[PDB]
Each structure stands twice: as C-alpha cells, then as structure tokens.
Symmetry: C4
C-alpha cells in the first residue's frame, strides 16, 4: 500500500514551531557533524532531518575550510526531526554534496549527487541501497533540490540542474518508482534559471518554488503533473523573495519573466493557498539574516503585493539562510489535507563570522489554523569556538 | 484500542525507588543536556523521562546563564526512565520552555509552550508531529503542568495558566483527542492561584494537586471530570506542603481558601488514598533542600494533620526542588489499580551554588504495599565543574 | 508462551569466547560508566550484560573513591553482550548496589537492592517497571547473586542474603511470577555461609555454586526444586575454588562442611556435568589474578581432585576477579540442552593499582564440544589514567 | 524462508558510490574505534559494515602499536553501511583478529578467529550467540576471508587458511547451517597459496578471488559448488592485480599457476561477468596507494589483457589498502540478478605515516548499468593526530 499524497494543500493562517535542534550550540562540546543544506521530509511514521555532512565535526581541525561547497568527504545522513545531526543517531544515506530525499509510503528514496564537477554522478538510493544512477548530462555541477523530493501514489518526482550557476543552464524533471528511473523531461525555460527547487504535493501535482541564480529576484515556479508535462514561470506576486533583492516598491513582478537585475540568490520556498501564496524570504535584503513568511492575496496568479498575513521567525539580528518545503502525510496529521511545513537553515561561521568553519542549525514550522505571534527562534551559538582559538 | 486508565488509585503504604539517572554527575564528562523541569509519564510499553533542555550541555560555555527560565533554545526532549538526558538517546519532542506530555494508549501527546512572553503559543504534538495550537489568552507567560498530563479512555486532560505569577491569574482545562483540541474550560478560582499542577487518574477522573505562587502555602486541589465540570479547592490537610511555608504548628488548614501569608512556591504533588493523602514536600521550610512524603489520615477531606506514615527520600543536606505525579498503566504493573509514582527534581547550581549554570537530575519512586526505610538518593555531583573554572 | 528452560545442562569439553567489551581501555577516551559486578543473562532474542554503575564515568573526578561498595548513586543498567557499559547504549534497570536479572521468556525480571545498610529494600522490576519489594529481614546489608537469576517455566528463582559478611548470616530463596513474589524459603545452613550465588537450570532445577565469606575455601552448593525444597552443601570436589585458598595438596574436601580455615572470598561459579564439575577459580591462590576453569571427574558428588580437562582464560600476570554462570536459551543455540556459559570480571584500579578509581571489564565464554587452547583474553588497560594524574 | 541467492551476477558497466564513513576524520574528535580489515555484507533488510577493533579509540594512548595484527583485545563489531565504526552504534559480534560474516536470510552468521597463533580457535556465531567452533588444524595462524562469507539457499560457505604466510600453507572450505558446521573440504593447491578470499554468489556457486602471499602477483581463483567440490586456479587475465606486482608488460598470465616472482600481497577482489572480469587493484605497483577497477574482456577464462572499461576510485596520491566483494540481496535491489558491490579499505597511519597508530576508513561502490566518471573518494584525515603529539 502506497502513501497516495493526492490531497489539496491545507489553507493555513499561521505557522507553529515543529522543532529546533540546537545543532551548533550542542556541537561546542557535543559530537555534531559540520553540515550544510539540512532539510526535512516525512514518512507515514516519522519526519526526519536530512543534511550534508562535511565529513567532520564541530570544534575539530577537520572543520577548517568547511565553507567549501563540494568535497569527496560530504555525505548525506539523517536523524529524527528536531534531533541534532550527531554521529550517534545518524543514519548513513548517500555520498553527496547535493541531495534530495523523500518517502513513497513504503521506503525512503534518496538521491545523492557526488563526484567531479565536470562529470558528477547522482546515486539513487531506495531503502538504503543504491538502485539507479543519473550522470551529468551537461557537464557542469549536476545538482538537485537540497530539500524534500515529492512522492505521489508511489512515483517520486524531483528536479535537477546542470550548467552554469550564473547564466542559462539546463534543468530536468526526474520520476522514479521504487528507486528505478521510469521517466525524465527537459524543461524549456529560455531566459530563465532554476536552482534548488522546494516542492510539495497539491491536488495530485508537484508544485515547486525555485531559485534564480542568474538575474531574477523573483522565484521561478513550476507545477509538474505525473505525466511530466509541466508549467514553468515565476511567482506572480509583486513581492521579491530572493536574496539579494531590491526594495518592495522599486519592484514590479511577473508571472512569466525574471525581474530584478541583481544576480545571486538563496534557496527558498512558497506554498499556494488557492490564488494566494505563503512566500518565504530573509528579513535583510542583501544579507542572509532574519526570516519571515508572507501571505500575498492572489499572489500565486497575480502580480499582487497585498499582504493579509505576516510572521517573523528569525529576527534581522540573527543569521539564517536556506529554507524549503515539505508536507505531513495525511497518515500523520489526521487532516483531510496536506499540512504545509517549512524549515529554515541558520548558517553560522564563514563567510559572515569569525571562524575557520561554516555550519548551520535549523528550526521547523508547520501550518496551523491560527495566526502565530512573531518571534526569533534563533541559532544561539556563541562564536568563535575553541577550534577557532 | 485505548489505554482506558479508568481504575482507582492503589492504596500504598510506602514507596520504592524506580530510577535514578545521575544526569549531572555523568555530565561532568558525558554529553548531557543542561535541563530543568524533568518529569515522567508512561505508555503501555515504557516509561519515559521528559525534560526541558537549555539547548546546551553541562561543562560547556553555552551553559552560562542557564538559571534563565525561558529562552528560544529550550526544547522538550525525552529518554527512557532512568536514563540520563543525554544527546545520543534523546527523542526530540517540542520546542518548549514549559511543557506536559502523556500517552493515550495509542500515541504520545506532548504540549510545548514557547514563544514571546506576551503572546506565547502552545504547540500540541501527537505522535511526534504538530496537530493543534493554543495561543495565550491572557497575554502573560502561557504555561502548563511541567509534569505528566492525563489520558482517560482516549481523551487527554491538562491544565494551563495565563496571567501574573504573583497575583490572580487565569487557569483553564484542556482536553484533546488524538492531538485535536475538543474541549476547554475556565476555572473559577477568585482569591486562588494555580500553577504547574501534578495530576493523575482516579475513578475515571483527573485529580490534581497544584502550586499557589500567590499567597497559599497549602496546595490547590482540583478534580476534573471528563465533561470538564470541576471541583477546585485546597488540600484540606492541616499540613502545608509548599516552599516557603511556616511551621506545622502555626498553620491551620482549609479545604477552600489559601492559608499561610508567605508567597512564592515550588511545584509539587499529592495522591488521594480514599480520605487520606500522600503529600509531597521539601524538608527545609524555606529552601529547596531535602525531600519527604507524608500520609495524612483523612487529609484529603479534612484539615487533619494526623501522620500515620512518613518517608524521607532526600536528606536536608542535599538539594531537591520540583516533584510531580504519574501512574503506571494497568497494562504495565499488572495490578487492578493504578500504581501511584512520583519523581523529585534535584536542582544543582545557581542560585544556591558556585556555578555559571543551573541544571538538575532526578529520582523516581513507586507505590508499594509496604513501608520503605528512609534514605537519601541524593544528586551527588561535585560542584563547581571545569566550566566554572 | 514461556521459555521453559527445563532441559539438561550440556556436557561440554571446552569453552570458546563469546565476547569481550574492552570497557576500561575504551573508557580512557570513551564515555564509559565506572562499574563493578557485571554479569550476563539471555532472553530468547539477545544476551545482555548487566552491571552496577558508580553513577559516574572513567577518567572523570566523580570516579574517585569508586572502590566503595555501596552508594546512593549506584544503578543497575544493561547493554548488549560484548558492548561496553557506555552511556549511549545503556538501558536503565534499577537503582542498585547489589543485583540480579533474568528473563522468563516474556519479559526481563531484575532485582535491585538499594538503600541504607540496616534497612535495605530490594526493588523487583519486571518489564522495566517496579512490581514487588523485599525488605531486609535481618537488618544487615540485604544482598543478592550479582549474577543471572534463574527462570524455569515462567517462575524465577534467586537467592538473597542478610546478615554478617564474616560469620553466620541468613539466606533465603525467592520465587516470583511476572514480577510478583509467590514464594520464599529459609535455608538451614548452620556453620555454613552463602554469598553471591551463581545459578543455572539443569533438569528443571536451580543449581547454584556460591561463595563462603566466613571460613570455607570450598564453595557452597545448592540445588533448588520449584517447590522451594532445597539441597544445601559444599562442592564435594577435593579442590578449593575460592580466593584466598590453600594449596591443592593441603586440602581435603567435603560434600557437607566448610574446609580451609582462611576466611574472605570472591564470587565464582561451577557447572555440573553428571557427577563431574567444571569449577571456576583465579590462578593466584591469594590474589584476584589470572583465571582458569577445571573439570573434576566425579567432583560434584565426590571429594575427587581428578582433573581430566583444564583451560586458562586469564594469565596470572593479569587481574581478574568475579565470575558467574548463565545459560543460552534452547531458542537461541538450537541445541537440545542448555549451553553452559560463564563470564569473568576483570577488576582494574584500587586496591591493587595506581588509581583513584576501581572499575572492571569482562570476557564471556561458552561451552563447546571440543577442547580450547589456553590463552589470556586480558583487560589490557594502561594505568594510571589522565584523571589519576 | 531463506534468502536463496541463486541468481547470476549482473553484468555491470560501472560502479557508483554506495557509502563513505569518514571514520578517521570523525575519530579526530569523535569516539571511533581504531580498526582494520573492514568489510560489508547484507541481509534482506540492511547492509552492515563489519570491522576488527583494536579494542581502543582514535586519538587515545591505547591506539599505540595498533600496527599489530593480532591481539587479545581485537573484536569483531558492526554498524550500518556508511556509518562510522563508532562505539555508540556498534553491535558486538565476536572476539576476533581475523573474521568473516554473512546473512542467510534468517540470521547473521559470523566467524571470529582468535586465540594464540599456534592453536587459534574460530568461534562461529549465529544470531549473536556462539554455536560452533573450528580449531587450528595446522597450528599456524588460523585465519579467514576478512570479508563477507557467502550464503546460498540456507547454507553458508567460506574459506579458511592455516600454515605459513610465506610458503605452502593449507586452505579449507567450510559450510554451515544455522551456525552448525555440516561440511568441510581440503583444497589441493600445491605450488599455490590462498589468503583472505573475496567471494560472492553466481549461478548458485561460490566464486572467490583470493590473495597469494607466496609468489604470485596474480590472484588465485576458486569456484565452490554446494557439494564442496571445487575448481581452484588463478585469474586467467594477463594483468596482475596484487601488490607488489610488476608492470603490465613484463607479465604473462596463467589460468593455473602463480606468475610474478615478487612475494607479499594485499587482499583484493574480482567479479566474473561471463568470460570477462572486473578486477580490483591499487594504482601504485609497489605501495598501497590509489585504487582502480578494470574490465578485462575474456579475462576470466583467458590470459587476456584487453581493457574495455576502467574506473579510478582512489587517486595515487592517497592511501588505500584492502578491498573485497559482496552482493545486494535480490530482496533489496529488486533486480533479477545479484548486484556486484565492493569496498576499499583506506589505511592511514603506520607503517606509511607519522603516527603511533594504524587505522582505516572505507568507501563502498555498487555495480550499475552505466560508466561512472573517475574520481577520488579519498580518506581525508589530516595526520598526525593530537595523540601523536
Ligand atoms: C546557485 C545554487 C548552487 C549552484 C551551483 O550552488 C549552491 C549554492 C550554495 C549557497 O550557499 O549559496 C550552496 C551549495 N553547496 C552545496 N550543495 N554543497 C551550492 N551547491 C553546490 C552543488 O555546490
Ligand atoms: C510560579 C511558577 C511559574 C510561573 C511563571 O514559574 C516557573 C517557576 C520556576 C521555578 O523554578 O520556580 C521554573 C519555571 N521555568 C520554566 N518552566 N522554564 C517557571 N516557568 C516558566 C514558564 O517560566
Ligand atoms: C561477602 C560478599 C559481599 C557481602 C557483603 O560483599 C561484596 C564483596 C565485594 C567484593 O569485591 O568482594 C563486592 C560487593 N560490592 C557490591 N555489590 N556493590 C560486596 N557487596 C555489597 C552488597 O556490598
Ligand atoms: C598474508 C595475509 C595474512 C596471513 C597471516 O596476514 C594478514 C596481513 C595483513 C596485512 O595488512 O597485510 C593484515 C592482517 N591482520 C589481521 N587480520 N588482524 C593479517 N592477518 C592476520 C590474521 O594476522
Ligand atoms: Ca536571484
Ligand atoms: Ca506558595
Ligand atoms: Ca572463602
Ligand atoms: Ca602476492
């Protein structure tokens, strides 16, 4: 029996905290992995926290130069949601410096991309055993969501990318069944750019809000049917949710094209709620600091910038970073819909801080039927560490 | 099938030790969380120790200022009863600086109150996944039992509080089913004050002995039916079981009103045994040191101060603190009644001791059919630690 | 369905190693409990290593004075056989400075004796939840096997002791069912002395080889029927298996009375093999060093000193100490008999060595159908530790 | 129901990474065992990493002289594939300084050889409980595969060795059922030498590529039927896959006899793919550095040196060492054949490096239907450690 995941995304008014691991504060004395790009995904029985290790530990010399993105030592592991990425509760998942993982109702599927930049291999694991393989088709840093992939009625959908990080690249959709690749598709997006999508299920379709690392300060949107016909564009809303981005005033908005002129970016998410959208963004406009989520009326389909709800999760005095989407299985929450949840990565260390290392901890939040008071569930580590001294 | 928990509380003559974790002594070298407010609760298969972490570890710099009550880093976690609140056996439960948790026969329900003082949110988890939410109704430190909530025939009952910690506040009863809030009630207690109740089941009803942080050195009592009609008052017995409290002589006793004149307090418990009561208190009258339990004949219904049984668990040379109630499931003990058990928190560090940190360890005791010799299962940590030096 | 344990003890020719935990060597850097009196017991699914913690860890200051026998901090915990008594794989069992534990086919029963010397309480746990209680009947250090208790057809049999450690004391037999005490018996042994028995099943009866801490250098033997009628005596064999003991020549032997004249002792074991006996002893005659096991033809029923088999397990350059018996469930080994197994405790530290601490590690051995070459599976820790310096 | 393992070995074009534990890098701060000879084996539910501990930990003084091969403290333990050989996730397996382990569909069988050189005992464990025993038949370091043994239709086959490490020795085949030895055989190989075979299933037969520590730089091959009739020889291919070995040009090749003239060696593997062979070897010809795998057309049956595929896994600037074979159960991968997988041991420390210790980490790779880009999933530890200083 599969976890069908066919329902509609609930309409939520606000977000309550799910979890907070204190990974970095604990790692000051604890045996915690140095890691980046954590994310959450759930099965009918548990929600887990996936992460990319730097094959080393906080407060140790091997944490030096952990600002580096890709390395032979980086592995995908997992723990229970809320737990710290410690050694002693960690499940090995895949060798990976870019990843995605998700459950199909019967078993975990995980994809781990590793290898050399010009010829990376993506190892598909299902049930903790390699089953398939995707080679780099364009020869330039084959990568993936860095968040939950999406499983609907037994098939699992995710988005990859190959090509420049600064100009046109190439993006595809992959679909597997019990670890086996049964489908793929090229996305036609000229003038567009899609990195590190954050996807979820919604009316039996894969909705994804991605990252434009080329020119858009608006987020590319993508809605994938099971037959791998797609709808690609930008988040209509007249509010920019990438970082770096311009003010909210000097911004227009487009359903179709990238707007903004600044390049760069950060991974992020958004949930549709009919015509509206809960969109995620850092508080700072130019730095990875602070985190809030906004509800834009009609923002999914219009260039609207009408805010009816807003909630701060990390204050702008505290570092954040990545954020992504996932959903609670109907088998878990009991609802008749899919409870939208998100996580925020909270980067500490280099390049912003006084360390030889870079790492991050996380907070997870879940959609509820009420408005939630603003606050800051901040990281709370005191830098530098002993290793930095 | 639910864990019905409908029986009568056994009549016990004394208490034998269940467990002792040595959390602080182990934390001198081990990787143990800095924590406060631990408590125990059981399922048909295990008893667990819940606790509030300070998002950091003993002997580490992040343990500084751990005397603080509320923080963004405080989380509810759990281990097996008797185990130390270590990192490597810990289950993440909820983000919380005030909490309660209990099992319904099918799954753990946990409530974790966190957020800002003036608008705290209580996240209801059931089965390790947020399901409901209670916002602060009175805008002043929404809080809860800091001990086991109570489940009877599938519904789970607990008591919250919002308002001043020094004068009249507001208290409610909440009732949920599989994580969903299906009921609540306002408690009318003018001139009264209810903090951190310690509840248990007894003839299909929730019996609670609470804390008066306003003026009573006697403990408010509360007996909750499943329909959320209640009976609120004070522990009749002519003996005061709060701290600070006066002598046993210069005290009268009331079934109805607060007596004593000193304010302040500490969380504590009591079990009814017909008309009598096993009541819990620190040995010192003005400090959180020592621990004994007393059996007052007719003490539940009279202002009696007749002691038939007495048992010292912590001597008055050693620190203690909180104490609370729980019960063994009939599915566990095999009895035809509910075995009354309690735990004592043993606070070490600030404000009483020579540290930058505050933490605590625990001992658990269970009702048996015999008298048990007095002794001191004391904490045993040697302060200050390396971090303090 | 129960684990009937009704078979005969196999006849084995030699012993192969089961396990070795390296607990102390690992504890030089690892987070290992300071412990004493470890022992093994098995269920139809696993064999576990029980031990008494000193509520502290190796290489830590709280390990000071760990030579002390009884303390409020000493707890019974357990791990998998062969694992180290580490914090992070440990199951809490009971508060105990003297203990026994055993499985009935359905659940673990454990007994943990703690409290004050003159009024100790023994807390009976079954399935990790206190169920019964035995108070000190003679008021002088109520204690027990310090090794596996014995379960036959659902009932569990063990031996306790109360009274002097140097003269006549009092010893009883206890029998429980699912944690409940259903029987007990006084053992009439005037001029005799029984400490820390090492028992096993054999033709549906409990065979025990104990310790005489009064005057015998021979080991008291005891064979318990399920109705609690017993046969008490001494190990007939003309060879002394206690420490301190005299030479093998200047010794006679008795089936009935204590021989030897030296007092003191150490816990030890023996298996019957028809009329013969595998008997366990240290190599040294006056110190707790070295370990070998001997097969005495007709030694169970005669004062024989005829050795047909012999096997050294610890050489006399290396420390040992306690040793005890247990059996593999027929459900585990597959045999049509009960495979005799033993463990040796290897004490390190005080009083023999240059430390502030005392601890021990273990080796487990199991009866096989062949002779096994002599060797020394010694402890291997390098003393003193960092803490000692 | 058994795991029949009767299928054919898949024909694979290349190898994708399964796992990488970073055991040594983590052990710079983590609590990781000092170990050697790790290997992988799988059940219908998980793949585990077996290893031989040195009964001590990295960065600790007890890691001194860990270059030693055999010791009383060396034990076989296991973790999940990809996990680090840490203390806190380790399963005790057997006391062993030479080992093999494998699953029969119902339970793990493990063999652990320990004891004195001249009379070693091999303890057979099945289901984590000793069941059988093999004594040294030739009196000179009884040893075994140091990799997965092989189970076909409920019976488990493996190869042992007794005798000189430099000249003729003696080798046997053992076959067991649920831990019980039901068969054995002498291998007639005069002028030959077989150490540390690496075996796998293939058409219901045990195929093994071994190590010649006498004179061959080619690897002895062995194909074992269930009736214990065998076919013994050398890997036909005209390419030498041992280390030390000569150039590929000044080498001939033999299906039958040892070629090469240099002695010494290292454990290694090979898979048949019809008439071809995937053969494993270090990159260096004289040192244990680098690792690649080659596909020789017709290499299994001819003295061919025709390479159609090649893949570098460890570069020749980085240390490697042992490598061995295993297979994914059909119950795991879903294929209609047995997916060939291998692991490479990556030795660090003595004799090559600036330490008092020797240890190693690992990488696991699995056969896929495509060519995989060359790279170096190297160890990555920075030597010397703190302990070395
Ligand atoms: C534009 C996003 C991708 C494209 C190469 O780069 C990721 C950017 C990034 C960041 O902090 O902004 C972190 C990621 N690092 C890892 N996944 N290890 C970058 N991704 C990769 C694959 O290098
Ligand atoms: C009067 C009891 C409550 C009311 C605010 O305060 C708790 C007092 C307390 C103590 O040691 O006395 C500890 C609690 N700390 C935490 N739960 N973190 C106080 N409770 C809160 C919610 O701050
Ligand atoms: C004569 C055996 C008993 C009788 C009091 O003493 C035990 C002796 C002992 C030893 O090393 O010889 C260790 C035990 N320590 C603990 N069990 N903690 C002694 N037993 C007790 C209960 O103190
Ligand atoms: C020739 C292979 C065997 C024969 C005695 O020796 C093993 C060589 C070896 C190495 O690094 O080359 C390591 C092994 N060590 C352990 N298994 N502990 C050697 N094997 C034994 C049993 O000593
Ligand atoms: Ca951008
Ligand atoms: Ca008060
Ligand atoms: Ca004696
Ligand atoms: Ca060779």
């Amino acid at each position: 029996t599969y976890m069908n995941n066919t329902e509609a995304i609930c309409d939520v008014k606000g977000f309550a905290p799910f979890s907070k691991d204190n990974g970095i504060r604990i790692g000051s004395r604890g045996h915690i992995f140095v890691i980046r790009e954590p994310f959450v995904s759930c099965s009918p029985i548990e929600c887990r926290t996936f992460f990319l290790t730097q094959g080393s530990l906080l407060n140790d010399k091997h944490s030096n130069g952990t600002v580096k993105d890709r390395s032979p030592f980086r592995t995908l592991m997992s723990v229970k949601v809320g737990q710290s990425p410690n050694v002693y509760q960690a499940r090995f998942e895949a060798v990976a410096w870019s990843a995605t993982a998700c459950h199909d109702g019967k078993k975990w599927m995980t994809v781990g991309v590793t290898g050399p930049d010009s010829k990376a291999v993506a190892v598909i694991h299902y049930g903790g055993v390699p089953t398939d393989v995707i080679n780099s088709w364009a020869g330039d840093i084959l990568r993936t969501q860095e968040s939950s992939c999406t499983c609907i009625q037994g098939d699992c959908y995710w988005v990859m990318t190959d090509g420049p990080a600064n100009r046109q690249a190439q993006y595809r959709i992959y679909k597997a069944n019990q670890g086996r690749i049964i489908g793929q598709a090229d996305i036609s997006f000229n003038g567009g750019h899609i990195e590190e999508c954050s996807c979820y299920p919604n009316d039996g379709k894969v909705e994804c809000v991605c990252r434009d690392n080329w020119t858009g300060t608006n987020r590319p949107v993508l809605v994938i049917s099971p037959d791998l016909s797609y709808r690609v564009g930008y988040l209509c809303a007249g509010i920019p949710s990438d970082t770096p981005r311009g003010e909210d005033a000097q911004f227009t908005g487009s359903c179709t094209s990238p707007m903004g002129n600044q390049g760069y970016g950060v991974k992020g998410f958004g949930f549709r709620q009919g015509t509206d959208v809960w969109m995620g963004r850092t508080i700072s406009r130019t730095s990875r600091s602070g985190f809030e989520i906004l509800r834009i009326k009609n923002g999914w389909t219009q260039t609207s910038k009408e805010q009816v709800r807003k909630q701060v999760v990390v204050d702008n005095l505290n570092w954040s970073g990545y954020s992504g989407s996932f959903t609670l299985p109907v088998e878990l929450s009991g609802k008749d819909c899919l409870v939208p949840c998100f996580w925020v990565e909270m980067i500490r260390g280099k390049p912003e801080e006084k360390t030889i290392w870079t790492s991050s901890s996380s907070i997870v939040m879940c959609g509820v039927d009420y408005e939630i008071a603003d606050w800051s569930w901040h990281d709370g580590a005191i830098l530098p560490f002993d290793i930095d001294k």
